Amino acid sequence: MIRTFETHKIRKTAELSSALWNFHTIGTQGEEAVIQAPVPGCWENYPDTVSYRGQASYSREFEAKGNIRLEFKGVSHTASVLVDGKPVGSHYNAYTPFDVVLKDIRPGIHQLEVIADNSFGPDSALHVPNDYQSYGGISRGVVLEELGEAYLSWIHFTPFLRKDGWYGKAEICVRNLSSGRLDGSVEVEIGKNSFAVLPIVLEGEEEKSFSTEELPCPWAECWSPESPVLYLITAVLRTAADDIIDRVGFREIRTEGKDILLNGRKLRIKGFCRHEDHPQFGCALPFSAMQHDLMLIKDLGANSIRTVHYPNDELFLDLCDEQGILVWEENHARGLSEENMRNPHFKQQCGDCIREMITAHYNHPSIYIWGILNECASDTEYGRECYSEQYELIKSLDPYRPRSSASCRFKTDICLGYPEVVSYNIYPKWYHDVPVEDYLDELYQWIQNESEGTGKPFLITEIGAGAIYGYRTPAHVKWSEEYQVQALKEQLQAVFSREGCSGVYIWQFCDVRVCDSWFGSRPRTMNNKGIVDEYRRPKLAYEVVKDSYRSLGNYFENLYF
Amino acid sequence: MIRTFETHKIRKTAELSSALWNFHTIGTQGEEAVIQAPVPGCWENYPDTVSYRGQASYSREFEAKGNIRLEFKGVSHTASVLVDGKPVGSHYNAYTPFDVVLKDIRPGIHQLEVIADNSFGPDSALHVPNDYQSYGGISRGVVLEELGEAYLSWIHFTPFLRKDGWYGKAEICVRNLSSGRLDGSVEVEIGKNSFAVLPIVLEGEEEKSFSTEELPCPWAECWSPESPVLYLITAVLRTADDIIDRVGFREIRTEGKDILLNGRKLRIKGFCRHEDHPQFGCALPFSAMQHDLMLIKDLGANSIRTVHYPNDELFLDLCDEQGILVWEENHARGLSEENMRNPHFKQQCGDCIREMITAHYNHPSIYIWGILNECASDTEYGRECYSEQYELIKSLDPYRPRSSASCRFKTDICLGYPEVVSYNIYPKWYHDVPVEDYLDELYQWIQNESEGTGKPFLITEIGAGAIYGYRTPAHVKWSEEYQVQALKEQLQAVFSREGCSGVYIWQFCDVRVCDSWFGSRPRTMNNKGIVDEYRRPKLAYEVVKDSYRSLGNYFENLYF
Amino acid sequence: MIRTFETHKIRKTAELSSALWNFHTIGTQGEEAVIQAPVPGCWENYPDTVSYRGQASYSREFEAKGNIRLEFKGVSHTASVLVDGKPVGSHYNAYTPFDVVLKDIRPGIHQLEVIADNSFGPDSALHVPNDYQSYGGISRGVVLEELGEAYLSWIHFTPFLRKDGWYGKAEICVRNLSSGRLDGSVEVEIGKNSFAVLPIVLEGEEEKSFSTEELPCPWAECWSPESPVLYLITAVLRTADGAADDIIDRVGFREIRTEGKDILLNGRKLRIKGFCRHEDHPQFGCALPFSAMQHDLMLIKDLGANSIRTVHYPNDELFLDLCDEQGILVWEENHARGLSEENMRNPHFKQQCGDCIREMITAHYNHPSIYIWGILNECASDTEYGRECYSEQYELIKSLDPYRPRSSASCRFKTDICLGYPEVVSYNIYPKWYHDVPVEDYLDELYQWIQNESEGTGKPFLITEIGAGAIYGYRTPAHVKWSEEYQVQALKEQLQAVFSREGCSGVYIWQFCDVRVCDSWFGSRPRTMNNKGIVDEYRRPKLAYEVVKDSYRSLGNYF
């Protein structure tokens, strides 16, 4: 399983994942055991490599002829792809998809080998020792596609809410693998309604996109948390032959003043930060584990998830689309110092992550905002140059969705003029003993009186508290579940009564494994601020969050007129 | 119960602790509940004050006439004593004893009240937010004595090992409560052997001490871990009063790189142990003390280090009787140069040292006095403080060796002063370096670059954290498996380190700490116990036992 | 420490416990090395004997001359006492005190040895494989007394509430150790008020009891939970030598009486808000120190309870002292739990029950906290032979204590044939734990059967056990049994029902804390523990702690 729907009926495709591949670590003189390992999977979950950091090899065979495309949905975190022993592709970043395209291969059985590497060091500017784990392995699916002379690389659909109803625009990218000029058309349907036919002309080996005009969609129903209506959009390429199928929802997301507006209504965010992490599956969570998390998150009363701190599996985003859950998705970065951001690969790897993330995820109605550079050095001049570059990269790829960044630069951020939404991570009553209301008011007033973020929508993108599941004390000391109950009660009461604040993401949904270097401040070498523990067992604070989130709706309905 | 033996047969004494007193917190405008609270006890263990920091009041009644003495073995941490509503004494520091002497009180029933305070702030230089808890309450016992017009305030006995066997010297301090001059004698016996009779002459209101000569003790058998023979020493004043203590005939001295007990080269197999228990705070009863001791003995240890303050004399009694060697230190842990410059610091350290050595002089188990654990021994002001306190110790007990647990890795400027050089190190917990390499780099520097060169060397702390119950195949830090492998490596290194006399593992059990340390202390506990706070053995318990049981108390096979 | 007050000022005494003694196992094919062990203590808490069942030796020395008494407050569970290598006494039952009296011993150093045995088998009819542990060792204190030619063996004080105020009677037992006749008097004062003088004539080697009349005590204030006023009662034996001996105890002026369906305390209708509590602790076995006792009591008071039931044996006098001073009502029972009809015809059963009852009431008579005597918890009250035993033992209690009410915690649901005998009818029930039946229905069906079809009709009625299991830390959204959430639900329904039941004087929750049990019970006892505590064995509150506290604190001590 790769998506919750079929993305191709014409193109010949087959999943190479959901299978056992041959696996062995590399980097030694001797023999290494070859074991049969699951793909998707993380090798930190296999008994003999629970602690392995380094390179390892995954291999299997496949059968194919002609022009082929191998799509990799995620390899943690550095990949080299070899087909029949020849290097044919490479990739950095565990959390965004990539592909290898091979022209006119011999028919028959081929050998596929992926070298996966989770090492830290100078080549890796995003994956570093950090407050979450960098796993190793083929952590998301793998797809073999047999192509013809040309194929549909992607389709991006954009809804528009006009005075008279829903309009839409489609943009399609076609890649010609033939050395000669190519002619044809692309026919586009949305939910079996006719939409457009685009004439295509490609010069030899050209990749180019073609846009339709803004067309009416009088048949379209809204996507919203209360009614998550989705449509399949289909593009069929005809030459002298190929398709792509995606899913869309008709919703508008814009900011106006201090309001985040969804389909014209003032949104209240009731959210969770959620890592892709699980004690048995690493970051390779199967469908069943995803939906289990989503059902707990819905039980808690939440309407939104924030993908700390990297792009998520499209299968998870699909499930948010289908259930009306709003998504903040951000590029892969957490807590990087100014010196970290001057790594010579940092800008290229951020740009690559952003490009791949938005190109792949453009169509997900659940995604209402793009985030960047969580807790990076937004208080420095060199930091500001990076924030500016990446914010403008986002706008060039998606001019419509709002943008933001979760800041921890308390009253020293110099980048708040750039985003549409100002967002702050704060931990009063955990890392600072100050009443939450006072801390939040001091920060909010500074933003409005002293920063270029004034008058914009404002989110608390992290608030919460640690608790080791099972540690309970009449003294309610920090790390006890009782103390976490008290902290979350006070924290949520303050954020939801802060005028000008659109809502909150609790840090965080579940406890998460972190890097060994963080052990000193991370009991059990875990981040323990989950409202459920790593085994999804509800801590005492679970009932406090549920009471709070279930007492509030998705929209501000009773604001002053 | 105050001691494991009776310290008085002539003097009239009654224990006022081991009882319920009336208790309420103070500092409010309204009514506070009066509850019946145990003494000894810490109010952090009573349900309604588990989080209380501040002042509280303890009171009961007692019957007495004439001259009386009220001895407090411990009040956590600042005390004010009132009798019939009049202030009559005060005290700072939870861990040392003190007394209140009142002259010629009317007969009948009297009101005793103790105001205990565990507050932090500028008045308190030793009790600070720290990596252990500052409890509140009457945490050790309370004794009422009815006195005549003079009494024995203490007796100190010193054994000497000479060419021809054991000698002894005794010093007794007598205090006169009458305005008139006082003449008498003091008869001293050890184990019902005649020892000396000292003539006494005291001016009015004078406290003065008198010493016997060095006298042979050919009947004396030695005290040692293998054979902890003890004798009762009794001093009887005649003008009428007595004092009884216990002594052991053992010699402790350093010679080169050796710590010598009765001429034999000692190997320390130790545990750091706080006075901490989840039910009893720092007010552990006899049964809880002996339970710890039986675990420590089962582990193969021969020694305990009183981190980071003097211990209950009842615990030291149990160590004397069981042959356990004790490192006892004054109350201080981790104080910066700025903390040490607190206007009260020098006074409070001096008072702690005086009360500690005066009260504990006779315990044969105590083989070394420590000071100023992890204080600022790398600074000049620190050195001034270490110097003063080391010399104070020598003036009070010129015979035991002195030391200090340092963490000033290659920067300590105070290693010229003590008889033993001692270091706290945490390789494979706080620093990922092979233990053998870290210890070698430190040991070489001491020998080649410091005035600690050529003296005996102890590791006074080494260990690793483990949250009891957290286990994982990945052996991450805080898992019990990781603590197993850390301790195995650490112990292997210290016992193979030539020049090192042994080790105190940090630590025996998990210990509650202050809320300000939560960030680096899971569960607001120090989790480096080999047993958890409920005394349940962690996985590493078997690794320590395997190490300690495979080694004796002495270096028997050194090069000749 | 043996008691919270001094029981002697004239008699010369010295505690031999609160000390290390020499300890080694005996009778094994292993090494029997000697270690230094605490007394009081249980050897299951010493690392090398954590699993040891059998015999072991405790020894120390003492110095004494002439007539001596050695008092043993508790040896678990079978003792042989030797002095200077010669056997001088023996005892069965872990939980009652006993003494050894020795005439005219040589002066100087003596060797004391105690062989303690916790084995199960045919000689032991009370200590059996059971739902609680039979520890081994000297588990309570030991006292050496140097006596003269006679001594005060006990003093029993009984208050009476009359129309014109408090009255009192005192009975003293004096034991002459001389072969010659003894003339003297016993002078008794209560709180420094003069009470009585009893003239004494004792033949050679006689032990005899002497009573006063019922005398007025106009100065006396009463004992109650709200005001637990206590007085020290002092008896001094005066002979030709002067004040030759004494005995000091403590009393409280309170009346306990049943009248109809009411348990009356100083006239008021009592409500029991109680806990069953074993003497069990994971570090201390059954040898809990003063600090551990008071920690338990402070938790029990925090929970809103006013009463404790000593499941299932007599308790340390130190604990009962602490209940006296804090106004906690005590149900105390003899040592027996769940013994079948066949278990009860063990040839030693009646002797051992009788010995336990005699020692319990003779030693504990004066405690004002004790308001009721229980016997034979969950024994074979539905059989004819069981009835015979109940009748014997109830009659034995009345001959030792004709004033306190009596009872027995029954589980013979609608089949008990012994409810005519006691003053209070008591039942253990576990609806919503062992039977899935709504608590109110089950309790109604039982209570109507008692009023309509048994000779228990019209008497006061208690639920002496109700509760549910929970393994601390096991929590699940499914609220399965053994989860802490399920225990919350069960206790809420359970306490609502009992306090709603017309004719019920109250309840003892089973139980205060989780308790170690015998290995043979493991099949139904997770962790080889009884897990029905409201705190766990380490005294950590389970979720149901808050449910109990809300229930108990919403009700007063009286109807």
Ligand SMILES: [Cl-]
């Ligand atoms: Cl954390």
Ligand SMILES: [Cl-]
């Ligand atoms: Cl720790």
Ligand SMILES: [Cl-]
């Ligand atoms: Cl159970």
